[PDB]
Amino acid sequence: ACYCRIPACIAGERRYGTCIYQGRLWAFCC
Amino acid sequence: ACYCRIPACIAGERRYGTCIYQGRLWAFCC
Numbered sequence: 001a002c003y004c005r006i007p008a009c010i011a012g013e014r015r016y017g018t019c020i021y022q023g024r025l026w027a028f029c030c
Numbered sequence: 031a032c033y034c035r036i037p038a039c040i041a042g043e044r045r046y047g048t049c050i051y052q053g054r055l056w057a058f059c060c
Contacts, residue, residue, distance in 0.1 A: 002049070002056065003031040019058060021047025028051055 025028035032060035 004019035007030035017028035034049035034056035049056035 001033060003032075017048050017049060018049030019049055021058070022042055026047075 002028060005029050032058055035059045 002016070003012075003013070004021060004026035006024070006026050009015045009027050013029040015027050016030050019026035019028050032046060034045050034051055035043070036054060039045045039057045039059035044060040046058045046060055049058050
């Protein structure tokens with residue numbers, strides 16, 4: 001599945017969007 | 031697992047914020 005991460009997507013993943021959660025933005029990673 | 035769904039989470043899914051992904055806003059549902 002895809003994940004929300006901070007600060008960034010990790011090795012093995014790439015960014016395909018942004019999440020909004022708990023007052024901050026997150027990378028959306030798959 | 032968690033997934034972006036539209037327009038809302040279903041059944042027992044718990045929302046963890048919002049996806050900004052693929053031209054749309056989604057509920058992020060676990």
